[PDB]
């Protein structure tokens, strides 16, 4: 049990003060902007749909309201996290006015934290994409970001998209070359990239039929 924080959407003075506090209590703060899988807790000023937030959800981190740290300060130790989760009733029944997007991001973070924890309590490693073996066929501009998000949820991303890799893959995601029909014939889930984020965000998992790539539909 570890206390490794990253901070998001807070101002510099808040970050300085919170870093000081976290360190005094025996925690660590990872200062780099990019999501770091070694963190355990992220304190978020206001939930935004971005790579860092999505990766935190894929990894099942505590995604916390800053009132968590104020409670730690008072207590003089790291307190129980559940009542400070952005998606907890304790926060959401008090911030009844936040917009629908932030509510959605909050709930998704709490839901995956709980689900991943429940699975980890049963010896399943990693996060939302645990056991996925993924072939990625996307635009060079989007490639690194998709890889990082998948890896943050515990997916292995395979090198390239050659036919021999189909026998190793569970999933193939493509931007709307690569032989999709053959991958589908070899029972790979051949899906639009929107599936990845929708798997993280949706209360009930996206259904493969709706995300299936055109050449793979008959193989469902």
Curated annotation (Swiss-Prot):
It comes from the Eukaryota. Changing residue 52 to A: Does not affect interaction with phosphorylated HTATSF1. Highly expressed in heart, brain, placenta, lung and kidney. Residues 1-86, 124-213 form the BRCT domain. Changing residue 52 to M: Decreased interaction with autophosphorylated ATR. It is found in: Nucleus; Chromosome; Cytoplasm, Cytoskeleton, Microtubule organizing center, Centrosome; Cytoplasm, Cytoskeleton, Spindle pole. Phosphorylated on serine and threonine residues in response to X-ray irradiation. Induction: Up-regulated during the S phase of the cell cycle. Up-regulated by E2F1 and interferon. Belongs to the TOPBP1 family. Some BRCT domains specifically recognize and bind phosphoserine/phosphothreonine marks on proteins. BRCT domains 1 and 2 bind phosphorylated MDC1 and RAD9A. BRCT domain 2 binds phosphorylated HTATSF1 and TP53BP1. BRCT domains 7 and 8 bind phosphorylated ATR, POLQ and RAD51. Scaffold protein that acts as a key protein-protein adapter in DNA replication and DNA repair. Composed of multiple BRCT domains, which specifically recognize and bind phosphorylated proteins, bringing proteins together into functional combinations. Required for DNA replication initiation but not for the formation of pre-replicative complexes or the elongation stages. Necessary for the loading of replication factors onto chromatin, including GMNC, CDC45, DNA polymerases and components of the GINS complex. Interacts (via BRCT domains 1 and 2) with (phosphorylated) MDC1; promoting TOPBP1 recruitment to DNA damage sites during mitosis. Interacts (via BRCT domains 7 and 8) with (autophosphorylated) ATR; promoting activation of ATR. Interacts (via BRCT domains 7 and 8) with (phosphorylated) POLQ; specifically binds POLQ phosphorylated by PLK1, promoting POLQ recruitment to DNA damage sites. Interacts (via BRCT domains 1 and 2) with (phosphorylated) RAD9A. Interacts (via BRCT domain 2) with (phosphorylated) TP53BP1. Interacts (via BRCT domain 2) with (phosphorylated) HTATSF1. This is DNA topoisomerase 2-binding protein 1. The lineage of its organism: Eukaryota, Metazoa, Chordata, Craniata, Vertebrata.
């Amino acid at each position: 049990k570890q206390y490794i924080f990253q901070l998001s959407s807070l101002n510099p003075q808040e970050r300085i003060d919170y870093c000081h506090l976290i360190e005094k209590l025996g925690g660590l703060v990872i200062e780099k902007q990019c999501f770091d899988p070694t963190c355990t807790h992220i304190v978020v000023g206001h939930p935004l749909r971005n790579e860092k937030y999505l990766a935190s959800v894929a990894a099942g981190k505590w995604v916390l309201h800053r009132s968590y740290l104020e409670a730690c300060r008072t207590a003089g130790h790291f307190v129980q996290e559940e009542d400070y989760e952005w998606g907890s009733s304790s926060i959401l029944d008090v911030l009844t006015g936040i917009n629908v997007q932030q509510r959605r991001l909050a709930l998704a973070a709490m839901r995956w934290r709980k689900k991943i924890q429940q699975r980890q309590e049963s010896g399943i490693v990693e996060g939302a994409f645990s056991g996925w073996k993924v072939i990625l066929h996307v635009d060079q501009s989007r490639e690194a970001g998709f890889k990082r998000l998948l890896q943050s949820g515990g997916a292995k991303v395979l090198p390239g998209h050659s036919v021999p890799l189909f026998k190793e893959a569970t999933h193939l995601f493509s931007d709307l070359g690569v032989n999709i029909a053959e991958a589908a014939a070899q029972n790979v889930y051949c899906l639009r990239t929107e599936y990845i984020a929708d798997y993280l965000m949706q209360e009930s998992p996206p259904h493969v039929e709706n995300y299936c790539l055109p050449e793979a539909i008959s193989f469902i």
